């Protein structure tokens, strides 16, 4: 059994959106199937379930009338749709088979809703009693994600790449730091490698004391 969810979505407020979950390996029409929200940093929230055989639905009151759950059994697909997205609809959305407990889960669809437009990050050095710390500040990008490595992946021990934060501006920012021997600052080169695929940006920043 597979529940295959549609790809990440990046939308403006007010726009409509339909995301999908296509099942294989069981009788789609004889089990309930439903949707769970998870905002980043929060727990799970039940949205509703549908019985594809006849499209009976059960909705949470906090989502009813904001979303529609639907199903097309001819292609074994369930759907979740919004007629008018709000920024607060930014979340991961999971489909899962419902028994009524959720026994088989899709991998999730990330939905980002923002007035922001695609933007690559700026990368600034965080320049450096035995240990020294240095890093890179990856500022003002949209949407997620960025990836950060150090020395093209040869430096991993002591690296903390922090979760992104959403700024009041609507752009994301994160820092990546690493602790190293103070004695190495004169003698080793430290470079943070940053990739932001949505904007096709690759940036290497040498971080010097």
């Amino acid at each position: 059994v597979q529940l295959v969810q549609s790809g990440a979505e990046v939308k403006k407020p007010g726009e409509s959106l339909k995301i999908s979950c296509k099942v294989s390996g069981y009788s789609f029409s004889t089990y309930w199937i439903g949707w769970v929200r998870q905002m980043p940093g929060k727990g799970l929230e039940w949205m509703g379930i549908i019985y594809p055989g006849d499209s009976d639905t059960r909705y949470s009151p906090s989502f009813q009338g904001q979303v529609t759950i639907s199903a097309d059994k001819s292609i074994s697909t369930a759907y979740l749709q919004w007629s008018s997205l709000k920024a607060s609809d930014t979340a991961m959305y999971y489909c899962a088979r419902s028994r009524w407990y959720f026994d088989l889960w899709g991998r999730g669809t990330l939905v980002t809703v923002s007035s922001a437009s695609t933007k690559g990050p700026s990368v600034f050095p965080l320049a450096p009693g035995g240990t020294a710390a240095l890093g890179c500040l990856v500022k003002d990008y949209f949407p997620e994600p960025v990836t950060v490595s150090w020395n093209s992946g040869a430096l991993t021990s002591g690296v903390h790449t922090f979760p992104a934060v959403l700024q009041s501006s609507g752009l994301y920012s994160l820092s990546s730091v690493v602790t190293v021997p103070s004695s190495s600052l004169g003698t080793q080169t430290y470079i943070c490698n940053v990739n932001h695929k949505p904007s096709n940006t690759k940036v290497d920043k040498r971080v010097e004391p």
Partner: protein, 214 residues
Amino acid sequence: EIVLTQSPGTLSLSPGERATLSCRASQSVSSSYLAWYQQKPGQAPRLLIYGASSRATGIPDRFSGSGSGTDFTLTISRLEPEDFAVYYCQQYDSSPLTFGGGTKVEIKRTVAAPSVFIFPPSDEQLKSGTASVVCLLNNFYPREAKVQWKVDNALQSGNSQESVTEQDSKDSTYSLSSTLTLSKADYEKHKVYACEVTHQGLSSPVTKSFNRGE
């Protein structure tokens, strides 16, 4: 709707020990229709237990559940490294099929004080008109800590953001960054930039500071 209360919010235990997680319902759940799920960072949840006490397919014997009515328990009888995760209960009796708020099971270790580092803004960023000051608290335990920003010895609220890592795989600690962001014009109106850190492992607060331009 039925509200599910999970306690404690966080359990701190050692490898090999037993975790007992609680899920209390505001109204009685019929027919033991209470499920438990595990979620690891970056992954979808997975089912552990259904019917309050039945193991889902493929789930190992160290996970068990019990209870009825308004009181339910999840037991992880021997904590393996994979088991330090977040756990959710859900009732699937009455629509809406509500989740509890989650319990995190973390690794308990000895107290470790943070090492603290402060980073002034880069000249490259300053050219662009903004100033970000970064404070790093490295490898501390437990997670509780306080960071305060001071500019010319005045406390700063509303202009900083924090981020915390998941627990470290090698030494079971946490790290935290706080970033204070000002316009360059505002940054140049002040001299002393400081972050002050309090933590159980510190006998008194640690302050790291710099003087802008000096």
